[PDB]
Amino acid sequence: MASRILLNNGAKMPILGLGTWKSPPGQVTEAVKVAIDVGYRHIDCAHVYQNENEVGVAIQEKLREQVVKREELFIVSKLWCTYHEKGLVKGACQKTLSDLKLDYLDLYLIHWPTGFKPGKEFFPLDESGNVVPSDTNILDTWAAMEELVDEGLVKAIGISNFNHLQVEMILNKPGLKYKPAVNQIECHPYLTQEKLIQYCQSKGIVVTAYSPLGSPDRPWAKPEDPSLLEDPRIKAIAAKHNKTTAQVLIRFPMQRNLVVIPKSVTPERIAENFKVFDFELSSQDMTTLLSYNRNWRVCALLSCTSHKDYPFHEEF
Ligand SMILES: NC(=O)C1=CN([C@@H]2O[C@H](COP(=O)(O)OP(=O)(O)OC[C@H]3O[C@@H](n4cnc5c(N)ncnc54)[C@H](OP(=O)(O)O)[C@@H]3O)[C@@H](O)[C@H]2O)C=CC1
Ligand SMILES: O=C(O)COc1cc(F)ccc1C(=S)NCc1ccc(Br)cc1F
């Protein structure tokens, strides 16, 4: 496959990136170094992951080593929910830039549509356990994102975990200056997202699929939960193609015109997951994988479900 997709800001984005949520800080520097050495050119980051400094050490070393040029990398980060404040967005972006050792990001996302009360805590709670909202809405936060483009801090802006009506709100914003380039959402065979993906694609927004392996290391995993990697129907498709189940799970979103960001800190898996450019799933394979949808989500959070902008009450 062509390795990059054209965004609506005119830049090209690698369709395969390395995820970094849960990558331990003592392992992620090596993971990113290995990833760049074996061909990855896109790293997905976030301030809330608490490991951007260590990701940045790797990026900077590989730039210094001249393994890659900065223009060949595509570095993504995300604005956390406690920084949806006009006066906090720039500083949040600049902290991420300082940690990652960069003078611009290729793409900066609103991590979740919901703003939370600013402060030290990433999830400020009331005494009954509900998140404490911010009064600032997705339109004013979007305007703040647009300023980052105009100041040279970021080349593209986008959104993450926005539902259909939230994307529409952004697109219908009075005075909209820059459209979102990307909507990054959970997507895999058990949460296939056909409706939201067609909506976004019809509007020229590129969709990035997160948790493509079903996030087996999520901290809230339970025994009885479904397991993509162990699903014998997916294993059978993989065997037919002489590939691993993970490789099928990565190739699947690629053939839907999605970007995909599997996470690993295991060097052998980082390499395995990149070897997805020399086979094709058939249309029948694709439709069969889509048939496994069960509307199952890795990422959801009870403490945030009353926030007025919590995204998963809407059907899509
Ligand atoms: N925008 C958002 O709200 C969100 C963004 N994301 C982004 O998406 C990325 C990917 O999603 P994530 O939830 O981390 O989970 P993934 O679906 O990428 O699964 C990661 C898990 O799969 C394991 N794994 C990786 N490759 C293989 C393989 N070849 N064989 C077997 N097991 C494998 C990893 O193990 P190990 O590391 O031990 O090798 C890890 O336990 C995140 O890291 C983050 O960057 C994710 C959730 C939300
Ligand atoms: O969020 C990630 O990228 C990966 O996940 C996380 C990553 C972190 F570093 C810290 C918390 C999360 C959680 S608990 N995320 C889920 C979540 C957060 C906020 C809202 Br609004 C809803 C929701 F479902």
Q: Is the CB of 199 under 6 A from ligand 2?
A: no
Residue 131 alpha carbon, nearest atom of ligand 2: 21
Both tokens of 207, joined, read 């969709």
Both tokens of 247, joined, read 């490789």
Range(s) of the domain holding residue 196: 1-316
Q: Whose CA is nearest to atom 14 of ligand 2?
A: 301
Answer yes or no: 49 catalytic. yes
In the annotated binding site for substrate, the residues are 111
Let me know the angle formed at the C-alpha of 168 by 115 and 212, rounded to the nearest 5 degrees. Answer: 70
Determine the distance separating the centroid of ligand 1 and the alpha carbon of 152, expressed in angstroms. 30
Question: Three-class SS of residue 127?
Answer: coil
Q: Is the CB of 83 under 6 A from ligand 2?
A: no
Closest to 180 (Cα-Cα) out of 209, 152, 160, 202: 160
Report the interhelical angle of 283-290 vs 245-254 (nearest 10°).
Answer: 100
265-273 contacts, C-beta under 8 A, 24 or more apart: 265/23, 265/24, 265/27, 265/28, 265/30, 265/31, 267/30, 267/31, 267/34, 270/18, 270/31, 270/34, 270/35, 270/38, 270/40, 271/34, 271/38, 272/244, 272/246, 272/247, 273/16, 273/246, 273/247
Resolution in A: 1.0
Biggest alpha carbon distance in the chain? 54
Q: Answer positive or negative: Cα dihedral of 129, 133, 138, 144.
A: negative
Query: What CA–CA distance (Å, rounded) separates 246 from 100?
Result: 28
Q: Which amino acid is at 213?
A: L
Determine the distance separating the centroid of ligand 2 and the alpha carbon of 49, expressed in angstroms. 9
Neighbour-count burial of 271, counting CB atoms closer than 10 A to its CB (0-12 exposed, 13-18 middle, 19+ buried): middle
Query: What CA–CA distance (Å, rounded) separates 198 from 217?
Result: 29
Q: What is the CATH number of the domain that holds 134?
A: 3.20.20.100
Contact 49, 19 (CB under 8 A): no
Contact 51, 77 (CB under 8 A): no
Q: Is the CB of 123 under 6 A from ligand 2?
A: no
Q: Say which experimental method was used.
A: X-ray
Integer CA distances (angstroms), 114 to 84, 99, 117, 215, 244, in order = 8, 24, 10, 22, 37
| Number of domains making up the chain | 1
Closest to 108 (Cα-Cα) out of 11, 182, 197, 57: 182
Q: Is the CB of 299 under 6 A from ligand 2?
A: yes
Question: Three-class SS of residue 23?
Answer: coil
Q: Give the number of C-alpha atoms closer than 13 A to the C-alpha of residue 5, restricted to the C-beta side.
A: 22
Both tokens of 111, joined, read 């991590």
Q: What residue ranges line ligand 1, CB within 6 angstroms?
A: 19-22, 44, 111, 160-161, 184, 210-217, 229, 244, 246, 261-266, 269, 272-273, 298-299
